[PDB]
Design a protein around this ligand. Structure first.
Ligand code: ICS
Ligand code: CLF
Ligand code: CLF
Ligand code: FE
Ligand code: FE
Lengths: 522, 476, 522, 478
């Protein structure tokens, strides 16, 4: 039933008595459901240390992964180039998913094509798909460049991307000079960040490998910036803003901020902004190259040092106070530009915010996850704030990374109760927040299901989620946020302390019970 | 129209190369009432042209994301690399009642997370170990399905042997599903693969059993995936009419419900495309008749309630008119409020395999006109059903390309578009109100009388929203 | 008791059983408390329509006001000028309160002085306080200017500010050239915003009234901007950024953003930034003067038009989409600068955000309060988002203002159920939120006590607070936010839609009860 | 560090003042000398603030409404006058209470007559009388009303005493007039006194002829604890564990009835001498009730106070006293073992109101810290007499310190920690000196008793050893 002037959506419509009795009869009648006390009993079991030990013995089963496959990263990297169409050689369903995944996080159009490889091509190869694919995409969506990656069926089959593209051009399907960089992106190797690295290195060597003879390091007086897999628009924006404030010349290599934030002004813009082919051709002439997320840009690093002869600085992701300081000082030394008053003051305003909020941040225990560079940057900043990063989980992390984070933890008293986990998923993390309860989770939207699980045990056990990372599907426009630099540290500090104070307000809202501590001033 | 539409079709296709132009021409047609065989005017269920940005998914989406995933008390393994199960985790709102992680598992992502070692040596030993770990950590699961991703078939794995062996060892239902994404040309074959897996590994295991107490009014909702609660808003009406809905395939469905279906008297098929296969099997093996029905909007819902009631006796037919009289004042107030605000506005649709024709009546019940529609993966029998619901001279498009859709919208200029997430933000930027017709834009349900209220509210809130006035700056 | 490794603060320490039994014993023994059943009955009575009718019959009693007294705004205005010390003639308790009130909102030092008038100065005037006060202040804190307001005691006894200041100069307590603008700021007239208007007009007269002979309208080619009572740093910044993007020469009169955001770098800076005496002196040579908040700048307007001879344009506060458009179009006409591409895109990005989020905002019902200009801007923007501003309260608003807001409501379908209240306090508003319950409140921290009252009636009756306005004491660093322009509209939009979605998640977190609607994607 | 150095710091800082202010402030700055025991030979206090020097002081309204009357939870307190005073003081002080706000308790609400110019020209007595009726209609469960006068009331000639007596008789309710106008006195201090006398004159004697209260040998009253963050509850719990019965708390979480029962107790336990010594002296002469001062800051002082209070009773209480001491002994020793190593040797400078500048010294010393400077906003000479006993030799004393002096003293002394108020906090944080609000406890607490020492120690450690303080200088500015 419905009241016309107060329409009910699924919630709370299905809480009306007649829907409840219907659902009760369906379950009792035909579902053959386990008794409720057996459900409550098994649930309690899943919150115990005993279950956790079984949970961490898993070898073959993954549950609720905190990572994606390589081609997702090759797509995002390609989208950062001017009028470039990402092209995933292989089966089409992959691309449907890649677009939907990014659609829901950015709430923007996301352009990507497949050559719709089929079980037939599994026998004689996808060569014909590439030839018709490239010619169709070029003529239909008129990109200036087509950046090719692969789905996992193409990798298994063994399609030689380089030869298929050369032949496409040889047989006339696309012009010889039309740029078609490529990268093999096997889903069964690494994760989505590896796909980013592979694509970018592929694009870099396409525009440079055979033209090194005329290159001179430093001749264009710029600094190459490689952002990596990055899904906050404000992180592309803050970097470019800080370098302009310093008078530093720079080339941001892979810049998707324009295309992922076009205005709604009556027309659709498939392409916007992005790194130019000519910035890439001229990149070897830079003073040097800075990798903003070095722990998933290893292949890129070998190419820029091996071919471009740049001496890539050892720098952590510019997150938090110290690592932003180090970033700006290394940029200053390379460029010969001093750090301007406007960044010195912004730095002090961050510190002022730190001193202002430290009493509510001190000792706060956190579980967190994400990609390796983002995770270690968050760990560093938490330690700078006096917080304790109790559970640190990076599904696509490795041993060398874990040793670096462990050393960061050991250099501070706020890391003494922290443990770093690699290769574990969000079902592992669920056990950790039950057996060693933190105060909050810092993670992506998949964390909302762990919060729900914790609340079900009891309100005293609930671990609220703070959404920082990727993907964020259940809040609007957080992709506009910033997490790098002083600006990003300011935003994270604000989100953290206010998440603490909002939760305190909830627990002290009880009239005559707990509202003695419901202070107006905090 | 008519002439202007065919001229628009030729103008759009002038950008394609020869091969694609000649193919895409066969997938675009103008509806003509003196031509009722869709075969004589449009081709469908063909391979997608490479590199034209099709909206289609794959057979894994058709089987795991559509048919199997919603079954709530089973654990479904995304067998292969990590991507497939992550991108489709919780993306489809096939609602259900349960305790997630304990006795229900719909929004969780189980996967074997293939590494390169599994590509070289094979994943069957990994699968066997994975099943044991599932059993130890999720004891209350009532059966496992193994949804094959692209690599499984290509490397020569034998997931059927693992299923038979482990199923016998543990005395558990383990369903191998060969829905590798490279099979077929779209999600559609995944439906078929999925329907056959149900028939071969689940549906025949209570042929032996009679312990079920049947009634002359037992039915099954075949092909309702309870998007936003759509199936619950339909079940309620069927049970108010006096019927007993024994199972819901697969929206909020349990495996035990599925196993009970061969005992019903009538299979009520909402989604013909995804489930006509198993409906046809159940008529052959068990003698159960099946009928298509439509719960989008009051007109179609009333017609369907009466058509279903005519398959039973005078008592059901009487309760049918009682339900129609009960809800009459409710949807009339909805029309009385929202039709004036929507009448005369034109709509263009593009969706999957049923809604492009099924929701037309609901729009008409609000005075709206569907000037164009199309499917991602429909067959010709779908289009036969579509030619009857669509008006004369309207535009039809099968497996539409992003370019085609954009160009048709620019010339036709609809007041509203209803499509998917990959299309929503394109047309919002062009200044055209958009409503997702897959996920219901996180609203719904839209089935039944209670759903029509939300549908009408939703079309009105979007079409007449003040944001559409302000896209152009007063200075341009 | 305490466990040394998990120290409990007041919450939840006093929930321990020994404190609980102790407090129960205190109440029963010596408090002579009304029985709980009687307390419940009265509470439920305070939520009814009949109590509301008695509540709105009040004539003499004010409960939980939503405004402050004039000198508060005069102090804020004065702080906006370079090396200026605000100076309140009267009793010292006022200054301790003004500084503290701003201290807790901005989390920054707030410099202000009194001349400590006592009982003896009430019988013979505070002339001697003024003489020594001015000399003591100048010699001790070395300001380049002292802006003088009054407390209510100084107003009641009739201290002639102009004469006392002239006598301080003639008797040599401070140099005759030392700038000492003044304004009478009776607490029993208007509110804190009236004090801002009075102070600014006072400062404007001091530097321009006697020197108009050489001034030619438009000769410096700038536009003057008067911000009014403004407690968001982002609002000063966004106004200055947009005029800089437009290439529009301008002069912001009263600009406190620097002194209200100094860095923590090892030294305390009593003064920073602010508009210069040279800028106030040159302001008559501007093309025109734009008032950002005209509904509390009536006196400034009369002077600017009556003495400077500018024709202040009729512009609403630049909040939301239309009024920011109108602001920029009027600034373009006056300055001859075209609206640049960068502001056109930012506008289109705001409209994009409106289309992405309109589904969750539509029809949402709000109660809101604040100052007149801020409120009507919030009202206008909410109508543009498809929201219904059901309860609009402005304690310090007037009848002509209410007419303007009613005309804005009447011109939109989303104003049909809205009512504008003037002269009513937050105890009036509490009744409205019970009898005609909205979905959310938008207001300052004082609203947290209304949310507590609604929850105590029931979770289904709770009305969450969204913190926008002044003062915000119980969250950290929201004074850094923006509410003006496209940027402020974007921030407001994001806060509103995510408050809606955060509440939905709360109401659908119950496992196997309501989590069928606990969607990953929203 | 040395006496000769601090004396030269004092005079060098005063070189900036005009001559008049110079001579006055020199009398409010002194350095402690263990040979001089009477403040009336070393420092003067409770004098008018000099104009224009940015004093930290409040007014008499703050001292009466803000600190004394406002915490009384089941009365309604009217900020009588223009809108300002009540709004700036709404919920600024954390005098915690149990109650149902808006129904039977009203502490964090702001009731006011919101004077307009009509009320200035015609007077507010007719307005006040109407307001009392409206309060009675909308807040029926209030157990009395006070009328806290703001600056204009006394200046325009209103007679709130008349309104109080008339309306009180008509409605049979306790209506208390308080002439605490902000221009009276020199600080909050006279607001304490005005408020104490208003309690005496209108509340305290209401049950002088009542004999229905059941007395015990162990009845006491906590006089001058305003339950900042629960401070009074974590003190009450100890007193009643020792076997006593706290009949009343003035005024933190206090009810009017508790106030009216206080003349029945056996002993008045005065925490804040400054604010409540007046009513304590009155109750000794009128009712014969003795009063003693005590200190519940830190384990050393809390143990000392407990034994002193127990010695006023019989052997059974003294036995339970040593039981409490032994019960909490392992808990506060754990706090020291963990936090003293982290704070010992650090130097503290204080500036607060009228009690804590001396009262919290023993707690800091219990954590090995050294209070090198302290001062009061509005203390009297008997407070400074008590301070010379608690303060070390050669430490700096400052009465009604100016913002300029406090900053200059900090620059020279360079203390590791500053404990003061909200108007000082953000000044010194920017200077890089850790700061802890010693009025509001920085929204932490309680700090009284043994449970409070655990929080206190935790709070000093988190702020003094916080990582933020080593980041103030940018690496490229060195
Ligand atoms: S199953 Fe099919 S594409 Fe029939 S694959 Fe698709 S929940 Fe669509 S038009 Mo998404 S044949 Fe269902 C469908 Fe229709 S996922 Fe849903 S909305 S009625
Ligand atoms: S068509 Fe369909 S979705 Fe595509 S893979 Fe094939 S089954 Fe799956 Fe999964 S993992 Fe990633 S996304 Fe592909 S590349 Fe291999
Ligand atoms: S010293 Fe003390 S606080 Fe000052 S007024 Fe006097 S009682 Fe009050 Fe209130 S309203 Fe505003 S702040 Fe003053 S100017 Fe009149
Ligand atoms: Fe968008
Ligand atoms: Fe600050």
């Amino acid at each position: 039933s419905q009241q016309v002037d107060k329409i009910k959506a699924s919630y709370p419509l299905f809480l009306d008595q007649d829907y409840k009795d219907m659902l009760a009869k369906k379950r009792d009648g035909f579902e053959e459901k386990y008794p409720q006390d057996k459900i409550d009993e098994v649930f309690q079991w899943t919150t115990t240390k005993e279950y956790q030990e079984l949970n961490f013995q898993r070898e073959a089963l993954t549950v609720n992964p905190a990572k994606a496959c390589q081609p997702l990263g090759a797509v995002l990297c390609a989208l950062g180039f001017e009028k470039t169409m990402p092209y995933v050689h292989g089966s089409q369903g992959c691309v449907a998913y890649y677009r939907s995944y990014f659609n829901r996080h950015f709430r923007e159009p996301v352009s990507c094509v497949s050559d719709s490889m089929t079980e037939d091509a599994a026998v004689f190869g996808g060569q014909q798909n590439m030839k018709d694919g490239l010619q169709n995409c070029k003529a239909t969506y008129k990109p200036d460049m087509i950046a090719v990656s692969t789905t996992c069926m193409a990798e298994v089959i063994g399609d030689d991307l380089n030869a298929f593209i050369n032949n496409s051009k040889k047989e006339g399907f696309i012009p010889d000079e039309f740029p078609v960089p490529f990268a093999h992106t096997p889903a069964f190797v690494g994760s989505h960040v590896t796909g980013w690295d592979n694509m970018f290195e592929g694009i870099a060597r396409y525009f440079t490998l055979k033209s090194m003879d005329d290159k001179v390091v430093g001749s264009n007086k710029k600094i190459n910036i490689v952002p990596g897999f990055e899904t906050y628009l404000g992180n592309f924006r803050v970097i470019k803003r800080m370098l302009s404030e310093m008078g530093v010349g720079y080339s941001l290599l892979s810049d998707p901020e324009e295309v992922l934030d076009t205005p709604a002004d009556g027309q659709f813009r498939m392409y916007a902004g992005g790194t130019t082919q000519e910035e890439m051709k001229d990149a070897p002439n830079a003073l040097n190259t800075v990798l903003l997320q070095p722990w998933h840009l290893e292949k890129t690093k070998k190419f820029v040092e091996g071919t471009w002869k740049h001496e890539v600085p050892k720098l952590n992701i510019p997150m938090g106070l110290d690592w932003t300081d180090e970033f700006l000082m290394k940029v200053s030394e390379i460029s010969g530009q001093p750090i301007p008053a406007s960044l010195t003051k912004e730095r002090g305003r961050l510190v002022d915010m730190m001193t202002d909020s430290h009493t509510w941040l001190h000792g706060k225990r956190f579980a967190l996850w994400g990609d390796p560079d983002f995770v270690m940057g968050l760990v560093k900043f938490l330690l700078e704030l006096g917080c304790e990063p109790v559970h640190i989980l990076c599904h696509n992390g490795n041993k060398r990374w874990k040793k670096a984070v462990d050393a960061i933890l050991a250099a501070s008293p706020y890391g003494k109760n922290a443990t770093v986990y690699i290769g574990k998923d969000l079902w592992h993390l669920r056990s950790l927040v039950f057996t060693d309860k933190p105060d909050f989770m810092i993670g992506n939207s998949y964390g909302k299901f762990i919060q729900r699980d914790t609340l079900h045990k009891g309100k005293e056990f609930e671990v609220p989620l703070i959404r920082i990372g990727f993907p964020i599907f259940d809040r609007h426009h957080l992709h506009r946020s910033t997490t790098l630099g002083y600006e990003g540290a300011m935003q994270i500090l604000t989100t953290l302390v206010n998440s603490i104070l909002e939760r305190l307000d909830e627990e002290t809202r009880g009239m005559q019970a707990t509202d003695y501590n419901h202070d107006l001033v905090r | 129209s008519r002439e202007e539409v065919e001229s628009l079709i030729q103008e759009v296709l002038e950008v394609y190369p020869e091969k694609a132009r000649k193919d895409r021409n066969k997938h675009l047609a103008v509806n003509d009432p003196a031509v009722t065989q869709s075969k004589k005017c449009i081709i469908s269920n063909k391979k997608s042209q490479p590199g034209l940005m099709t909206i289609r998914g794959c057979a894994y989406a058709g089987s795991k994301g559509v048919v199997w995933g919603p079954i709530k008390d089973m654990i479904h393994i995304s067998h292969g690399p990590v991507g497939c199960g992550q991108y489709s985790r919780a993306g489809r709102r096939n609602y259900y009642i349960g305790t997630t992680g304990v006795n229900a598992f719909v929004t969780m992502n189980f996967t074997s997370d293939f590494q390169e070692k599994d590509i070289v040596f094979g994943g069957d030993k990994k699968l066997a170990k994975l099943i044991d770990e599932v059993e130890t950590l999720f004891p209350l699961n009532k059966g496992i399905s193994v949804q094959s991703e692209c690599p499984i078939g290509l490397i020569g794995d034998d997931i059927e042997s693992v299923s038979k062996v482990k199923g016998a060892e543990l005395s558990k239902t383990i369903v191998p599903v060969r829905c590798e994404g490279f099979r077929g040309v779209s999600q559609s074959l995944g439906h078929h693969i999925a329907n056959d897996a149900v028939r071969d590994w689940v549906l025949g295991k209570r042929d032996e059993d009679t312990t079920f107490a049947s009634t002359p009014y037992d039915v099954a909702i075949i092909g309702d995936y309870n998007i936003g609660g759509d199936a619950w808003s339909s079940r309620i009406l069927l049970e108010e009419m006096g019927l007993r809905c024994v199972a819901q395939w697969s929206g909020d469905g349990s495996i035990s419900e599925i196993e009970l279906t061969p005992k019903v008297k009538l299979n009520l098929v909402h989604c013909y495309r995804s489930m006509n296969y198993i409906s046809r099997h159940m008529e052959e093996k068990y003698g159960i008749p099946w009928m298509e029905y439509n719960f989008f909007g009051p007109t179609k819902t009333i017609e369907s309630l009466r058509a279903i009631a005519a398959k039973f006796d005078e008592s059901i037919q009487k309760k049918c008119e009682e339900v129609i009289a009960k809800y009459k004042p409710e949807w009339e107030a909805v029309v009385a409020k929202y039709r004036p605000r929507l009448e005369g506005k034109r709509v263009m649709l593009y969706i999957g395999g049923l809604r492009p024709r099924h929701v037309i009546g609901a729009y008409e019940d609000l005075g709206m006109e569907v000037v164009g529609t199309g499917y991602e993966f429909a067959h010709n029998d779908d289009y036969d059903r579509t030619m009857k619901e669509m008006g004369d001279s309207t535009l039809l498009y099968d497996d539409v390309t992003g370019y085609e859709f954009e160009e048709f919208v620019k010339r036709i200029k609809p007041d509203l578009i209803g499509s998917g997430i990959k299309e929503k933000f394109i047309f919002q930027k062009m200044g055209i109100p958009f409503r997702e017709m897959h996920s219901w834009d996180y609203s719904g349900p839209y089935h039944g009388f209670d759903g029509f209220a939300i549908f009408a509210r939703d079309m009105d809130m979007t079409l007449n929203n003040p944001c559409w006035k302000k896209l152009q700056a007063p200075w341009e």
